[PDB]
């Protein structure tokens, strides 16, 4: 069923964040993990899988539960996600989710998906994100959406953001769900903790899914 839309007091307010916004920004800058048709080479814990991926070396993917790890352990997959280094351990980069079966999931062409951006309840702009996957992780679409908005609207800057609140909403026929784009209030922001929201490996159909971004200004 459908996640209820955020009421205003359920949203993180950037003015309550006194840490370094750069630590959010870098997650949605150019660099990200992207591998095509790879299979896990190892596993550290029961809820992770380890891949050998080229940087241009090893990527630990963490999942929410054992069933996700077991499902993909011996499958050829595509990997797409925002990764981190700080507090990345296994006995070098880490990410959450972002895994899809390769076989039978490829489109012929890249497919454009509208992103509708609202600012203070007003229709601000639209743009496209693209994928060549039938089933794509919400993580992939979220990264692409924010990457565009970082480049073109300075969604995140070094110190802070021009926006007080921001959430991305995914709509799939009847059902919708959303992610808070701002850091939790306080001085601390942990990349590993933030990115863990993607660890459910949530997927959507690129044919049908709609993307909306709601921003408010200060």
């Amino acid at each position, epitope marked *: 069923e459908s996640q209820p839309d955020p009421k205003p007091d359920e949203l993180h307010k950037s003015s309550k964040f006194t840490g370094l916004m750069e630590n959010m920004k870098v997650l949605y800058d150019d660099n990200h993990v992207s591998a095509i048709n790879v299979k896990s080479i190892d596993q550290f814990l029961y809820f992770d899988l380890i891949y050998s991926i080229k940087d241009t070396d090893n990527v630990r993917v963490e999942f929410k539960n054992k069933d996700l790890a077991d499902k993909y352990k011996d499958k050829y997959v595509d990997v797409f996600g925002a990764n981190y280094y700080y507090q990345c351990y296994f006995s070098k980069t880490c990410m959450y989710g972002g895994v899809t079966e390769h076989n039978g999931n490829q489109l012929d*062409k890249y*497919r*454009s*998906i*509208t*992103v*509708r*951006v609202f*600012e203070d309840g*007003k*229709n*601000l*702009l*639209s*743009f*496209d994100v693209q994928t060549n996957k039938k089933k794509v992780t919400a993580q992939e679409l979220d990264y692409l959406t924010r990457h565009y908005l970082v480049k073109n609207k300075k969604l995140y800057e070094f110190n802070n953001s021009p926006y007080e609140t921001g959430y991305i909403k995914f709509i799939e026929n009847e059902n919708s769900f959303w992610y808070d784009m701002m850091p939790a209030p306080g001085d601390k922001f942990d990349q590993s903790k933030y990115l863990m929201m993607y660890n459910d490996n949530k997927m959507v159909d690129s*044919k*049908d899914v*709609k993307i909306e971004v709601y921003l408010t200004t200060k």
Partner: nanobody
Amino acid sequence: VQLVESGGGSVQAGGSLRLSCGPSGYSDDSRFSMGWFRQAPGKEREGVAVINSHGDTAYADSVKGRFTISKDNGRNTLILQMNSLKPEDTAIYVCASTRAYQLYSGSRSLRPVDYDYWGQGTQVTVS
């Protein structure tokens, strides 16, 4: 917003038709995207050609180099110029448009779900 198509019809293979749509309900400086979709007899609706608010376009592979979408600002018309028509192009063609944005409507989506307004459709037959 209303979308009223004209210029449908029938031609021999190799022929030409020019579809036209005059959108009502927008402001003079509304920034929105517009497209042409078609639905063949027992198939899903498919995006044919789209133009965003600053005039960039995208096309389905099957019509590239044959069909041209354009927007006449002074006449307030969306045009689909259809050349080198094939039997496979037979379908009900329908105009679609989006809500308006302050800054720009950059999207060039060919997915039906991404449009907010739809015309009534006009028959094109090639045979």
